[PDB]
Amino acid sequence: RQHDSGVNQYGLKPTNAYDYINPTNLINFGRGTTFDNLGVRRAGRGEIDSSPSHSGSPVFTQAKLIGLSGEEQLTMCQSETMALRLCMAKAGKETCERESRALDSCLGRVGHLRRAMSEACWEFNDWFIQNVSDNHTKPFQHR
Amino acid sequence: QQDVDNFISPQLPQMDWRNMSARSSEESIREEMRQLAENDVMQHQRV
Amino acid sequence: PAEHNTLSSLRDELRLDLTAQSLKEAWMRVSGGVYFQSVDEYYASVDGLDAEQIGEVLAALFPELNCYEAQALVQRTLECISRPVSAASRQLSRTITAEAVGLDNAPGHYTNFLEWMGRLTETRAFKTEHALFEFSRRKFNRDDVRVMFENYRLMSKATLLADSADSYSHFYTVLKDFARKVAGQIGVRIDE
Amino acid sequence: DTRRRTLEDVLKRLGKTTRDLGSIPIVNPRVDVGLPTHIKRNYQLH
Amino acid sequence: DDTSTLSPERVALRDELARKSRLVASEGMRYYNIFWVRKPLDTMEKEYYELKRRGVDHGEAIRKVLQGFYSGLAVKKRVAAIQAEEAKLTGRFITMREATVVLGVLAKLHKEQLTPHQVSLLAKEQGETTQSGAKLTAIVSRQVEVKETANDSVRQLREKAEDQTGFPDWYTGESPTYS
Amino acid sequence: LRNARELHRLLPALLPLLDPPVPTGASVCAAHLIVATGHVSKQREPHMSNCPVLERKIPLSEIASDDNFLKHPCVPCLKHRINFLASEDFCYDFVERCGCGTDGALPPEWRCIVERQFGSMAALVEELVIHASNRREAGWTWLVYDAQQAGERPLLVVNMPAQRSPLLLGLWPLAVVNVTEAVLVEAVRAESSGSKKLSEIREKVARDAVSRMNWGFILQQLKKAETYYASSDRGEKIRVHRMKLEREAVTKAMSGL
Amino acid sequence: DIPKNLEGERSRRDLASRGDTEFQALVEFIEGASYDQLISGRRFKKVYDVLSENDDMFIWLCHTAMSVLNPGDMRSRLIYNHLRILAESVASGEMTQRTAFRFFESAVRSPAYREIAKRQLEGGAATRLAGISAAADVMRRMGLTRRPMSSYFELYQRIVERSEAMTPWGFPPLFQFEERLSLE
Amino acid sequence: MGERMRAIIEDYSKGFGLGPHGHSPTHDTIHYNTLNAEGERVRDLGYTDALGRLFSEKLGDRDVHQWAVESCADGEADVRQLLLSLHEWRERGRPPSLLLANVLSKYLEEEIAAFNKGIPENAPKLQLETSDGTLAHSGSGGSRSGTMWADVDPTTFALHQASQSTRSTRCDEPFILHLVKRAKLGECVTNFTD
Amino acid sequence: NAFSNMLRENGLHDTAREVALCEAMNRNKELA
Amino acid sequence: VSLILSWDGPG
Amino acid sequence: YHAYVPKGASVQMGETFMPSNIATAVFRETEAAAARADKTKEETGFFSQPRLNYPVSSGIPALFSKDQFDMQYSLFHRDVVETLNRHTLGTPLEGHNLETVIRKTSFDATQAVAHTAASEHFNYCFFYKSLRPWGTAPPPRLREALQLQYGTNGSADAMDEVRRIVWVTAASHQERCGWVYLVWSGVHFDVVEFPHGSCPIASDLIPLLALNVHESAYILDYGTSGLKQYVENYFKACNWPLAERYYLMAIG
Amino acid sequence: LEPCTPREWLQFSHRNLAYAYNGALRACHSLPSMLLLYKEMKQRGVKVDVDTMNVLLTRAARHEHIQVDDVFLLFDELVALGARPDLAAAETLHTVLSHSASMPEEWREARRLQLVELYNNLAMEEVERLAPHRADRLLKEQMKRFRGNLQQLGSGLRPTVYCRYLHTTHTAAVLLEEVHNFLWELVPNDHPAM
Amino acid sequence: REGWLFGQQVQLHYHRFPDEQLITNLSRWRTGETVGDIAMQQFRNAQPFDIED
Amino acid sequence: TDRIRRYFRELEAVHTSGSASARGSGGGTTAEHKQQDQFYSPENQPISLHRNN
Ligand SMILES: [Mg+2]
Ligand SMILES: [Zn+2]
């Protein structure tokens, strides 16, 4: 037919006896809810209730994994920036733009590197949702 | 800038024959065997 | 992979045989960094030089070759440096060998199902389907649409009755340009 | 296709259909051919 | 169900065989598995067990079987070279040293963009070079003029046939006669 | 086999165009024909206009029969035909000389050379066998002498495409094995007769051809060769010729001045 | 989404007079380039739905082809008939996809199946050609599509796209088929 | 409607008995006509006699009936008989009756001689001799006529040889107009069903 | 070129072509 | 021309 | 029973003529046959000989005796295939089409073995597919094509002329090792002579007819001088309509 | 596409249609398939180009069976439709005039006369183009090519174009070298000189 | 249902069947693009690491 | 991988532009291209496309 078997015309299709006494459960799981969004309990992405779950506790640290935007975040170029800083501090009679060229080269690459990592990480979010996450259905293990 | 200033050598396959005959000798093939058996161990190098 | 030199450098001595690898390293040494995706791109860069014209240069250099084998030599070299050409001629040759061999002694007639499944990828009907599939994904623009439209308006009820026989080909008449677009500019208006 | 009369429309303007000719060797009324032709085409049948 | 039919001993054996030569491992299946043909890995395991039950120890049996494979391959590519020679002096087959002339042509065509006229001209003067072309060509440095050695040609291939004598009869050996 | 008649008819139309090499004469040797006719340049002698074998009007084998072509012959064609004939009957003649399994007497000097080169006589037997056995075409296989590396390697085995002569490469033919498919075929049907895979039977033809060889003939051949490259007139001719080639380089380099 | 149940002479008149709806939709969308209409996203949506209508069956067949290690020899008329029947039962809604899949993998093949499988397979993974050739064959012999090629194309294409995915031929059992909770 | 249509058709059109591989068409593991392997085998062979085309070569253009009145002098044989047998032999390919074989033998003798004049010793010749009673051309080794087949069903034979354009069926019209329609409309004129 | 030039401009191309042909024809056996 | 329109062609 | 009867044997009716001796000799030949069948099952490579569309148990009518054709099929060709298989395994060419073996081995001396065997395999195949046992009459459309090129003011002059040019081409190839093809260059017809170990696909032509000019082809029947007679007979036995549909597919 | 809406009319022109058709022409690899397209673009009035002329004349001169006569006819007709001949075109015409020895003599001389006319008009036109830019080296090269092509044709740059040229020269060196060139153009190269 | 390592619902792999590289690339394979192809060789049967204590 | 890509884009760039030092007026130029494209534009040689020069 034209859509899911777990979702009928008016909302989520109510199997257990809990659904018939409490049928708010069929049509509202939160403020990220739409009508196509029933039966898929996770909502879009960047959206309310979009977070995937791992053994029931939601995954809110994704960027921290690939080391984009974390305190522990991976740094691409260090040796360069240190080298250039050393150059600046030593003397003012000679000015080295050679160091600043090696560095700006390094950065120029870094941009594309980062977009790559981000893309790969979104693919990870997709994979994690398909083949791992229980969609907030299992009891917390973490306390 | 030109005035200031100012691989298609035909190679016949018949004239090479002497060199090809050198490769039919079991010395050179003993050698290619040793060569290829030394390179046949599994490489972990890649690019 | 076996017999594949992993560390090979450009100052290494040229290998004796003709392989995609040996020819591409060779070509790197000869032309420098000239690399083309396919053969028609090369013919694009030379602009107006057909296979056979060059075929005469090579028919001159290697005297005992035929005239046919001279163009063939060119095509084989170019197709080693880049992808194989897409041509009706080569599709026909492929078909002809495929049926010159016939059935095979493979257990499930394996190589024959290979051949058959491949040869239908080049078919008209398959291309039409590929178009309808990319269509389903909203891969067109407005212009593609108006093109499809005016491709449709060109039919008669008679043409429809004929081209609806195949149950496919009328879809091809409508989608032809778009299919051709997936699988494969006026500057400024000068008036009187 | 020409301005000749077949024996067909000769029958239609006379109004004999195909049945009346029955003692005549012609089977197909709508061909353009002589009587002798009609005889030779059907000859091996009898 | 997926459970290896291969017992750990077998696994270790064909794994060792496979890692000592990649040729042996790839032979049957390079791209997809060709499963109606026998495979070197298997044949070699067979004759390995054969060696073991004739009392050959592990090391020597392995290196012996591998030698068997390598020697067979040696035969094969000797044959390949023996026919390669014939095929090259047949005139219509090509190794890399001539292919560089073909690539040479394609690259000259691309580098300096050529009119079909210029191409045909190239063809006829390269035909002249190819046939009438001479070894030992001289440049004028004047007084002083120097001669050096050029590329290949057909006339050179003649003069090579007469022992650089310039004459068709050098062979004193017995042959048929015509009168 | 014998082309002596077809060449008897063909030759007089060749000889006036060969006068460059030598003019009309009584006795011509197939060897010297083969070499005179060997490599033909498209540039100097082309196919004359309305070449009867070019437009497929007459076959190359029958150009000997019609006299219209004999009056005004097309040089490259006539050449190609004569080269083929002379070469092939050179082959058959030569084989009838090496193919005498009559005397099982084996010379000491031959062994003396062969062991220095190969290391035994069995080594040479095996060389001839794998060269005749494995072939890209059905031709003749030759054992010849090359003066070039001759100090190092006196002898080598070249299997020539079809009937083509080794004289064409400047090699001195010593002996020959006939693997042409007539031999293979009559061998096949010699086996089904009495009182099977192709590979093993063509190798059986190879190594039953090797056992029928007459080595004395090869002794004479090799001695003739060595004597020849030892001759003075050889050196002299080489000098005179290379002198001519130098004069030509010089005068062609002066022509543009 | 009321499925029409079949009826008397008018309903079969309109089963025989139907023509290609795959095409008619396409035409009507195109027709929005006419001077007197606009181009509609709704008309397009209808075309899209008709083209992509083949996911319920094509998806199932993709699973039978790629999701099953060693489904016997799929050329043999026995297993072939199993697959045929189950396919015609996934179309026309007579069976759940999950039920038809578990039917397929639990179907009767041959005595001592695993121990005959040790005479062919090492890790129990057969070759996937027979599967795809059979799965295309079934859709052709059953009347599944109006235009013949579409069956094979879609079944092929959907596999090629999944080839690039991490752990491509395994599936979580809950999301693999129809269940209460689904993927977006 | 469609499903029971298909059921009836597949049930009525199914084959039975044993095939060349010795098994039923529905047999479990072993199959016939894989990938239209027999279809192609008919494509490249085709069903025709050598005798058929020798005749259609010598007769050339001229009238079949005329030829029949010729090849029979008055007292020879009934024209209707050899007319019948000729028609059934040419289209609807059949073994020729020994009547037609005798007539064709003394008619075509030079073309059969010329077809037979070069052949090696152990290879099949072409011969019309009815010394044996039966006409079935599986009986002679297929050497009686030029046939490669034991039997071909009439309809298919007729379709195949009519796919060769030699005879005139829809060419009854005026000649040149027929040929001009053939040229300008091509054979693709019947792509159109209207 | 006095003739063919006029005829091309007055609309007659073929006659102009033939006439030019005829003028060249004349000039050939006039010079030679 | 009438002939070219009406003619049958075997004879 | 077909599976159980060995490869060569014919399955027929008992006439009860068998003395017990030869009746036992037969069973022994069958046992041997079973053994050699078991080893040929394992010797099997990727490529194999083509199944013949027509029965060759007797000769090919007007052309070959049984022994001639079966000396081509079961002797030379099968050797070619053994070679091809030996040299396409353990190489980058494993398990590809006949084409992609022919085409990727074209014009290289190193792979000359693979290429020669491949092209011979193709030639033999196409030769078998070019022979229709009782022959056939060339179809109208092909005759129209050929006439526009070879025909000089004569009726199907193109047929006598084509079967002449083929003869001439055959006689003009002196080495007697190779093939003669009628092919479509893509802009015109012509009759080309290929040397042994060369193929029309390698030169990127489209083949229509094949004729085998190897001496091994006509030796047992026509002797060494019998080439003309051989070709003349070949046209009695050739297959035209094949050449036609290939031609028409080439054009479009 | 024929314009339908005023918006569509603002995208439209005959002179731009030229561009699109030129592309579609460079696409066809054979002259026969090109001729059709050309007939169309001739018939629906489409402004035709140098480029239409280059891509036509080239693929007409390579096409093996063309009567040289028609190559020139075609050129003439392209020019009647107002395509501006240029160096490529004239040069291709020249190459076609070489490869034809088979025509009548008066034809060859007529077409040689026309070709010389053409090369001279070209040289003048091109001097006028390059002169105001003080291009001297480049101009001198272009003249070198016009001269070179006009000598194989057994003629030269007319005195007229040498006058127009000399009046536009800037360096003195070029002026004298140009008078020099013009003189050498009259005599062959072995001629007595001081 | 949970895998032991990280609780995955599938068993980790990259490829499974012998044919998949072929069948995926099939048009390239008939064409002959894939002859010297080292991508279809190197990674054809390549499987994930064992990440386990 | 990115290194490789960049190496081979700058190489082919260098050959497209170095062809000009190989052939000045050799060819590759259309008359219509002389009409439309020889004018200053944002793709050809813009003045500056940005504020604060
Ligand atoms: Mg919440
Ligand atoms: Zn000639």
mmCIF file of C-alpha atoms in Angstrom, chain G residues 54-149:
data_model
loop_
_atom_site.group_PDB
_atom_site.id
_atom_site.type_symbol
_atom_site.label_atom_id
_atom_site.label_comp_id
_atom_site.label_asym_id
_atom_site.label_seq_id
_atom_site.Cartn_x
_atom_site.Cartn_y
_atom_site.Cartn_z
ATOM 1 C CA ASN G 54 8.132 -0.567 -7.367
ATOM 2 C CA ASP G 55 9.808 -0.492 -3.909
ATOM 3 C CA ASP G 56 7.395 -2.886 -2.077
ATOM 4 C CA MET G 57 8.155 -5.755 -4.474
ATOM 5 C CA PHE G 58 11.553 -4.780 -5.861
ATOM 6 C CA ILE G 59 12.730 -4.205 -2.318
ATOM 7 C CA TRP G 60 11.546 -7.646 -1.271
ATOM 8 C CA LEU G 61 13.263 -9.291 -4.227
ATOM 9 C CA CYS G 62 16.434 -7.397 -3.417
ATOM 10 C CA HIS G 63 16.357 -8.994 -0.021
ATOM 11 C CA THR G 64 15.795 -12.484 -1.358
ATOM 12 C CA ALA G 65 18.713 -11.994 -3.756
ATOM 13 C CA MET G 66 21.303 -10.263 -1.561
ATOM 14 C CA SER G 67 20.197 -10.867 2.034
ATOM 15 C CA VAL G 68 20.403 -14.640 2.084
ATOM 16 C CA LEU G 69 23.553 -16.750 2.259
ATOM 17 C CA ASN G 70 23.237 -19.915 0.192
ATOM 18 C CA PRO G 71 19.650 -19.995 -0.982
ATOM 19 C CA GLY G 72 20.374 -23.227 -2.865
ATOM 20 C CA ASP G 73 20.751 -23.299 -6.629
ATOM 21 C CA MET G 74 18.264 -20.707 -7.760
ATOM 22 C CA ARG G 75 18.007 -21.937 -11.328
ATOM 23 C CA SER G 76 16.385 -25.259 -10.257
ATOM 24 C CA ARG G 77 12.628 -25.365 -10.900
ATOM 25 C CA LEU G 78 11.890 -26.186 -7.257
ATOM 26 C CA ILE G 79 13.385 -23.194 -5.476
ATOM 27 C CA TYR G 80 12.476 -21.116 -8.445
ATOM 28 C CA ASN G 81 8.816 -21.969 -7.989
ATOM 29 C CA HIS G 82 9.083 -21.147 -4.280
ATOM 30 C CA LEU G 83 10.346 -17.689 -5.160
ATOM 31 C CA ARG G 84 7.785 -17.178 -7.885
ATOM 32 C CA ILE G 85 4.817 -17.968 -5.689
ATOM 33 C CA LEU G 86 6.042 -15.877 -2.780
ATOM 34 C CA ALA G 87 6.630 -12.910 -5.089
ATOM 35 C CA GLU G 88 3.089 -13.037 -6.489
ATOM 36 C CA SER G 89 1.983 -13.200 -2.853
ATOM 37 C CA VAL G 90 3.900 -10.064 -1.844
ATOM 38 C CA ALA G 91 2.270 -8.263 -4.705
ATOM 39 C CA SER G 92 -1.503 -8.316 -4.221
ATOM 40 C CA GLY G 93 -0.901 -7.949 -0.493
ATOM 41 C CA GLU G 94 -1.714 -11.563 0.431
ATOM 42 C CA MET G 95 1.400 -11.734 2.605
ATOM 43 C CA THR G 96 3.550 -9.521 4.755
ATOM 44 C CA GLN G 97 7.053 -8.990 3.440
ATOM 45 C CA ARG G 98 8.483 -10.354 6.642
ATOM 46 C CA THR G 99 6.323 -13.445 6.464
ATOM 47 C CA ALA G 100 7.179 -14.105 2.824
ATOM 48 C CA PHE G 101 10.871 -13.681 3.542
ATOM 49 C CA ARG G 102 10.833 -16.068 6.472
ATOM 50 C CA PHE G 103 8.845 -18.339 4.194
ATOM 51 C CA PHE G 104 11.527 -18.172 1.553
ATOM 52 C CA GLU G 105 14.446 -18.897 3.804
ATOM 53 C CA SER G 106 12.568 -21.672 5.625
ATOM 54 C CA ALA G 107 11.318 -23.313 2.433
ATOM 55 C CA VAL G 108 12.097 -26.960 1.709
ATOM 56 C CA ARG G 109 15.151 -27.484 -0.481
ATOM 57 C CA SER G 110 16.971 -30.806 -0.145
ATOM 58 C CA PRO G 111 17.811 -33.372 2.523
ATOM 59 C CA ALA G 112 21.039 -32.873 4.492
ATOM 60 C CA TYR G 113 21.267 -29.372 3.109
ATOM 61 C CA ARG G 114 24.192 -28.111 5.104
ATOM 62 C CA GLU G 115 26.237 -31.212 4.460
ATOM 63 C CA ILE G 116 25.776 -30.853 0.721
ATOM 64 C CA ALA G 117 26.666 -27.198 1.273
ATOM 65 C CA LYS G 118 30.042 -28.325 2.644
ATOM 66 C CA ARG G 119 30.741 -29.795 -0.818
ATOM 67 C CA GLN G 120 30.398 -26.393 -2.503
ATOM 68 C CA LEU G 121 30.792 -23.538 -0.045
ATOM 69 C CA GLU G 122 33.449 -22.728 2.584
ATOM 70 C CA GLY G 123 31.683 -20.069 4.659
ATOM 71 C CA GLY G 124 28.249 -20.787 3.200
ATOM 72 C CA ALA G 125 28.067 -17.792 0.867
ATOM 73 C CA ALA G 126 26.929 -18.765 -2.635
ATOM 74 C CA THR G 127 27.297 -16.738 -5.817
ATOM 75 C CA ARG G 128 24.704 -14.036 -6.381
ATOM 76 C CA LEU G 129 24.187 -14.320 -10.154
ATOM 77 C CA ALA G 130 21.613 -17.113 -10.105
ATOM 78 C CA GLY G 131 19.632 -15.131 -7.542
ATOM 79 C CA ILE G 132 19.385 -11.956 -9.586
ATOM 80 C CA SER G 133 18.712 -13.771 -12.873
ATOM 81 C CA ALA G 134 15.904 -15.753 -11.254
ATOM 82 C CA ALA G 135 14.522 -12.672 -9.455
ATOM 83 C CA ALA G 136 14.368 -10.746 -12.728
ATOM 84 C CA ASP G 137 12.934 -13.770 -14.520
ATOM 85 C CA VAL G 138 10.071 -14.051 -12.038
ATOM 86 C CA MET G 139 9.069 -10.386 -12.408
ATOM 87 C CA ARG G 140 9.100 -10.815 -16.170
ATOM 88 C CA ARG G 141 7.038 -14.012 -16.303
ATOM 89 C CA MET G 142 4.583 -12.692 -13.757
ATOM 90 C CA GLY G 143 3.083 -9.582 -15.353
ATOM 91 C CA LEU G 144 4.517 -7.255 -12.723
ATOM 92 C CA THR G 145 5.438 -4.278 -14.888
ATOM 93 C CA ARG G 146 3.778 -2.738 -17.939
ATOM 94 C CA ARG G 147 7.118 -2.141 -19.640
ATOM 95 C CA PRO G 148 9.312 -5.289 -19.494
ATOM 96 C CA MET G 149 12.755 -3.790 -18.829
#
